Amino acid sequence: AVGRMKFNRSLLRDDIIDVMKKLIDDIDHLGNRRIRSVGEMAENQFRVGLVRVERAVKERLSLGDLDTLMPQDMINAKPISAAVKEFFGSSQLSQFMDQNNPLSEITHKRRISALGPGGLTRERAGFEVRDVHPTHYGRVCPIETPEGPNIGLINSLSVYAQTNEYGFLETPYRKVTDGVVTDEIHYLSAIEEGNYVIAQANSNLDEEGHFVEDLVTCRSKGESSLFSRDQVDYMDVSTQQVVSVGASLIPFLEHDDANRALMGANMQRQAVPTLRADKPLVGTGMERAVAVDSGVTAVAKRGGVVQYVDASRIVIKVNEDEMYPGEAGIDIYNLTKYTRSNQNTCINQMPCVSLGEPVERGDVLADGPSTDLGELALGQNMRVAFMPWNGYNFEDSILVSERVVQEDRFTTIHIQELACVSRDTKLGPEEITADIPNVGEAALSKLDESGIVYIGAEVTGGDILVGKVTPVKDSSLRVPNGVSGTVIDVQVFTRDGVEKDKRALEIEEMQLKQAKKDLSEELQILEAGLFSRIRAQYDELKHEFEKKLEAKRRKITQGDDLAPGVLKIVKVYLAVKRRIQPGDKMAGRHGNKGVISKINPIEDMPYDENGTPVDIVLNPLGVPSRMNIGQILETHLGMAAKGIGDKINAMLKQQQEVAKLREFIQRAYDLGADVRQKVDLSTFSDEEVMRLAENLRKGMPIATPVFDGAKEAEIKELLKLGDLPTSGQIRLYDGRTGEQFERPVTVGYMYMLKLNHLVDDKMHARSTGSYSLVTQQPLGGKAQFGGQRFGEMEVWALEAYGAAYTLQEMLTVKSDDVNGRTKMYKNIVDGNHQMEPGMPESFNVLLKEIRSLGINIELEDE
Amino acid sequence: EFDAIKIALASPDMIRSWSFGEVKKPETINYRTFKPERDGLFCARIFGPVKDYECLCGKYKRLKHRGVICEKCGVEVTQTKVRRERMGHIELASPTAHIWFLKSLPSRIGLLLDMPLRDIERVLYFEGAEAIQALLKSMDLEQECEQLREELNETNSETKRKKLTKRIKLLEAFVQSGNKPEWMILTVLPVLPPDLRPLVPLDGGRFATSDLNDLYRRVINRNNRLKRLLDLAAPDIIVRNEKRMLQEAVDALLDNGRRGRAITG
Amino acid sequence: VTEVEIDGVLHEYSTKEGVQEDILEILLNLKGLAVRVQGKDEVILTLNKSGIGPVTAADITHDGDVEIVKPQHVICHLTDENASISMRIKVQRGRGYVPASTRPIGRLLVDACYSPVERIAYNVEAARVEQRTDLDKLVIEMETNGTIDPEEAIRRAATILAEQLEAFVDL
Amino acid sequence: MVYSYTEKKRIRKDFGKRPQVLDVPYLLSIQLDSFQKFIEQDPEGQYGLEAAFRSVFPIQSYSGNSELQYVSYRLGEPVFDVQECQIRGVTYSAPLRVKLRLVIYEREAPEGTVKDIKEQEVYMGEIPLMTDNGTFVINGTERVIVSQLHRSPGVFFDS
DNA sequence: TCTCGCTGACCTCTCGAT
RNA sequence: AUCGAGAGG
DNA sequence: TCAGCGAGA
Ligand SMILES: [N]C1=NC(=O)[N-]2=C([N]1)N([C]1O[C]([C]OP([O])(=O)OP([O])(=O)OP([O])([O])=O)[C]([O])[C]1[O])[C]=[C]2
Ligand SMILES: [Zn+2]
């Protein structure tokens, strides 16, 4: 239908004839490409399954039958199920979700890919497809693209971008009539907006809506040019219309180059949630939208008064107007607690409400990972000093105070799932019982009577979690090596027909009893209100409650559809906390990144006149070489915000009347050249103002929308209000000597992020191990415990050095010389090391492969 | 020890010399058994035992039993390190053309003769391939070389002289190198050792299948079909089409995608 | 605080019914506890409370040796009346930062921030002694948790400095 | 300038200068709209499972006068919710219940009326369901199927 | 002389499905 | 092992 | 994909 419409529109409308007539007489333009979402692709896969079923039905019914043909035997659900299962799980566009943080999930769900079935190829694609087009404005983010081969092909949807009925991306614009902007909104596609001339968002307007400037900058026909007020037809709806969700989270984006903005937008997605979510002192105002729409935070479905608060669950008493006639009036929100992620991080929900607190619709009741009071919190605000420090921040490196490690600001929980699967074997060689041959007494006592480890036990490397022996060599599941943690959860899975051992029955029934108790408590919580109302059909309610309990018990006890050939699967969850160390990647929101090089003692760090040291020391040489001035501006604004917060905290420490706090906070919120926000504290009550001041005592959050952020003068005024220098630089003193640094150093609070690039996950070292079969070479992965590839360029380097023996030993003694390897290991262990290199097995493989081609290749002796 | 790498064409006798067993008729190891199938693509008789220094019957179980063949087992006592070394061959029912020489940038199959690439492709495609072998065998290197040398000596044009000297150089290379013509047409097709094509086991029953194994199995299927249709008289059109299919199969085995669409599984 | 044992808790990554705060948050709040012991380095404190209301540092059982300088800050909260909390807190004396990673089921190791000094700032100003104006005075500013006496802190620092200097004094 | 209780607890200082006339839409509205079009009942055969069925439902023998039809379709309640689908490691899917129909006509008598009509309801595979967050649970792993940027069908003239 | 196939276009890690 | 999807340099 | 290359026409 969209294809027919496009065919009619292109020819301004036998069909083959009309194409030739216009042929005798830009593909990257958006009007030529449409968006295909998950629904349409699922429909196409259903069509494939259905046409397969139709072919089967035709084949079966070609015989023909009188009254013996029915809808049942003609069709079969197997092909449709197979097709849909293949699509959801094996399609290129069906991707393992990025679950590092809410922003990563949002970006993945708003992702648009030019690849996939019926699409382009990354290696075949050229520069034209990968480059920005004038139609990308407002529909596809020009900033956020992958840095690898997928550049320009993998794209992110803009903030305000939609899709029309035909599947073409469209953007909202403010209709301009008779020279005055009108609040009505028209969504325009690329081909539709090409005709019109569109004013810019950065166009000053009067109270009535007329353009302030006599001539208003605009664009038309893919080019931007100055226009008068009369010709203007449309206006941009916002300054964030072009950037995506990830790119709009960067404060002071207009002061960065698009390269570093791209880098910051990408690195915001690898940020690992920490122990405590810390709000960004300097932000944009899109954090709340991202946190709410990500779905990681529990949002009140109906407005009411909180009735029960707990770490694990929250109960809301719905208001009288919001209860359904049959509804009892209770909303229960169970909270996710320490669950593994796709990226092995932790998902946690913590309540942000107290008992009896009023709640309206849409309010946040629990805070998901990297969320603080409904605001996305991907990192920690850190006090940064831009100055060289003895070369420990030499080349983009980062120096971190020991107080950061002590306060666990960047400590993260990582959960690892290990699975033990018992398979069916004839003669019963494999065992799953607790008793295993040649097992230590301590290791045996570590596991329960059921053979599984206790929940909450501390396990180090080389410790068995689940006991198993197979012939009988111990097939017990154990942690591989190095990894240590605590057992936070154990799951046992058995099929409906799979035989259950009594000890395994004990463990599974303990888990099922816990689940049934939870379900019964949840049901009774809601049933209590109905029972009390009945006190003021008791048998019917009791029967319904019993039926629901029986259904829940049956669902809990329902056997899992285990794969054929396996009896029971035991899953053990290990949770460990990773503390920052030298080797961990750190980054901000402006493209800056680095690796911690030293953990510096608190006294050695540079300190202010008040004795307060800095947390982070960053090299100032990385700022002007790059074009990320936004980090400096954010540092100054964060210093001003923390100064305001420090003044509030000082007035809280010594008891101060609410009038003074109200006056100061009103003055702080009213500051600015001209701000749309008008916070009125006279509306608030005394308790509300006290709670607001308590929340603002650690620093007043600042919102700077992209391309509409705070000016330098406003930052200077905010610094003035906090009794801080307007230059943003303060006199620092060397911690080791007490000597003042000869120049003023800029000091402030910059929002630092910890990326999922920990050094312990990356550190690897292999001596010897498994070798591949076709070529007797070491394996090629850290998980496989393989060596490092010595590519051709490194061989060139050794040839340039003239290192003949080193190259020879790396080519033969370290790989592909089985006899050479075997003799070399003994020589090295004995202490008298001598090698005799031989023919690599790969050369013999090459000779055999060439001989199998029909060409005789041999080894001439002389 | 070795001082040089000598490369040359392989005679059918040379290919049979490499091979330890002349059997490749079946396809896969087994549907449910780890034991190699007898005479298949993976086989203990041809390529060597999967077991390391063992006999399944167990008549002789000792270190002296090494090199001794049990009557029931019929399989060597050696390791799999020789299973990487042992080779086999497939006796093609009809001769077939090597894709490399026919479809190279210079068609040396057509370069010995005078026919263009299109003519040789048409002749071998109908199948056919024995006609090209007969044409190559009937050619005489000495007489043709002498005639070409005389023609190049009495040359009127530079391009003709270049073509004549290229033909003379190719003939002299064939004469001096010791490789006879018509060896570009293959009648015995060697098979790679089994361990060089993994067919790696998985945790489940299903194994990931190497592409070389599938290509070999399809070529052997075509060869067996040709053997049956030659044992039992069949119409000429069907036999010619089947021989074309076998030629396409061996071409995809030797170099997939050179001529026509590549084999997709 | 070094170790914390809660009756109904097996590991840090869990929740207890009737308590608004997670066990990890409870451990952090117990880490942020300042106490003074005169008798010995090792002491065990027991906390017990029932019913709705915040659980503060005053709720730890009273011990003659142990003095809680700040009984106001909360450790955890109880939401419903039926819930109760019962924990055993272990307090040791040391210096510096000793992580729990560096050297039973149900006990929770806590990272020990032993040092009671939060901030130190010193300023040097002119002093008038007799008719001399070349002399100056040192004004040291301290911020602590209340565990240490500032004069005792000065005495301890000077004693440490002299103990280090006596090596240089000797040959 | 804060009305929500969550925002009233801590109001962010806004330095923005340009008034906001259109609020930021739902960030995952594209996935929800697409899967709602694919799943929800369509009175016309334009979008979704309805449009899919009207394509190859009339499977029958050539000139056999006996064709296979249907009246409607319905999606059942999933056996497990999202959380225990992730726990059990199974796909979060809803069984598809379709009511098919079959018509029998007289042999070699097209003018005669249909001999009989047979209608019956049949289960047709499991269709995975997408959660409230726009994602899918397949084999216990939470998955996202991204949109595709493909050339619009039609005719274009390029060199 | 000009089409016309044939040729060419570093290292590391994670995940799942076959 | 291979393929697909990502990511870092 | 996009080149560049010689060798058939
Ligand atoms: N063969 C090859 N193909 C590639 O595509 N890339 C390579 N190598 N690198 C290696 O990594 C260095 C730059 O990375 P980066 O992120 O550190 O950038 P940068 O400008 O040097 O510093 P910064 O990030 O601080 O701005 C560069 O030389 C190279 O060795 C990166 C990409
Ligand atoms: Zn034997």
Side-chain angles (χ1 to χ4, degrees), chain A residues 411-423 425 428:
Chain A
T411 305
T412 59
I413 309 151
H414 290 122
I415 311 168
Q416 183 183 6
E417 168 183 352
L418 309 188
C420 166
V421 185
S422 70
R423 321 194 100 101
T425 45

Side-chain angles (χ1 to χ4, degrees), chain A residues 280-320 322-356 358-423 425 428-429 434 437 440 442-443 445 450-467 471 479-480 482:
Chain A
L281 268 183
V282 186
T284 300
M286 294 299 291
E287 292 93 9
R288 276 191 192 288
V290 174
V292 165
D293 297 5
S294 174
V296 295
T297 72
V299 165
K301 300 191 286 286
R302 276 177 297 173
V305 161
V306 186
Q307 184 205 98
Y308 185 64
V309 188
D310 187 9
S312 300
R313 64 187 293 273
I314 295 152
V315 179
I316 297 290
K317 181 67 179 67
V318 194
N319 299 327
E320 62 271 21
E322 307 202 34
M323 294 183 286
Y324 312 133
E327 172 58 57
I330 293 298
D331 286 332
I332 298 184
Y333 304 79
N334 273 274
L335 306 187
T336 316
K337 276 297 174 189
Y338 293 99
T339 55
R340 206 196 43 93
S341 189
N342 279 339
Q343 277 65 38
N344 270 18
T345 70
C346 177
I347 297 93
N348 210 328
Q349 274 188 296
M350 293 182 286
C352 68
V353 290
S354 58
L355 188 153
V359 161
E360 52 167 77
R361 186 169 20 81
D363 288 1
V364 176
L365 313 180
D367 274 328
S370 283
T371 298
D372 175 278
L373 262 71
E375 281 208 327
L376 183 71
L378 302 175
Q380 304 283 320
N381 308 272
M382 306 303 289
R383 200 183 184 188
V384 291
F386 286 97
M387 57 160 273
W389 204 88
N390 292 90
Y392 275 107
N393 49 352
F394 163 52
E395 185 80 60
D396 273 326
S397 187
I398 301 189
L399 176 82
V400 177
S401 177
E402 200 168 66
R403 179 158 287 173
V404 184
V405 177
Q406 295 173 348
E407 294 185 356
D408 274 341
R409 311 217 55 207
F410 282 119
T411 305
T412 59
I413 309 151
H414 290 122
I415 311 168
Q416 183 183 6
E417 168 183 352
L418 309 188
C420 166
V421 185
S422 70
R423 321 194 100 101
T425 45
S445 67
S450 298
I452 320 166
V453 75
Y454 289 109
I455 280 178
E458 309 287 295
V459 298
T460 195
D463 280 332
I464 62 170
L465 303 171
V466 190
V479 290

Side-chain angles (χ1 to χ4, degrees), chain A residues 151-177 179-189:
Chain A
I151 186 168
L153 306 168
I154 283 172
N155 282 359
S156 291
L157 196 68
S158 277
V159 173
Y160 289 68
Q162 278 186 354
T163 57
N164 53 3
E165 47 260 23
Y166 306 108
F168 295 127
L169 289 174
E170 51 178 15
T171 58
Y173 291 125
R174 297 173 65 179
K175 174 77 173 214
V176 174
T177 61
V180 65
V181 191
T182 285
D183 291 331
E184 66 186 0
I185 300 294
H186 294 156
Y187 279 73
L188 302 189
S189 59

Side-chain angles (χ1 to χ4, degrees), chain C residues 104-124:
Chain C
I105 297 170
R107 90 289 184 276
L108 320 172
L109 294 201
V110 186
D111 290 321
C113 310
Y114 285 124
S115 296
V117 177
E118 182 65 26
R119 194 179 43 114
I120 297 290
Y122 69 91
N123 185 14
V124 180

Side-chain angles (χ1 to χ4, degrees), chain A residues 147 260 263 396 593 626:
Chain A
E147 283 170 68
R260 294 297 166 180
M263 294 208 203
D396 273 326
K593 55 184 177 178
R626 307 166 169 173

Side-chain angles (χ1 to χ4, degrees), chain B residues 25-40:
Chain B
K25 278 79 70 175
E27 287 87 11
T28 306
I29 188 166
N30 194 292
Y31 50 97
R32 79 176 148 182
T33 308
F34 82 101
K35 287 179 70 176
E37 198 265 356
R38 176 185 289 113
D39 301 337

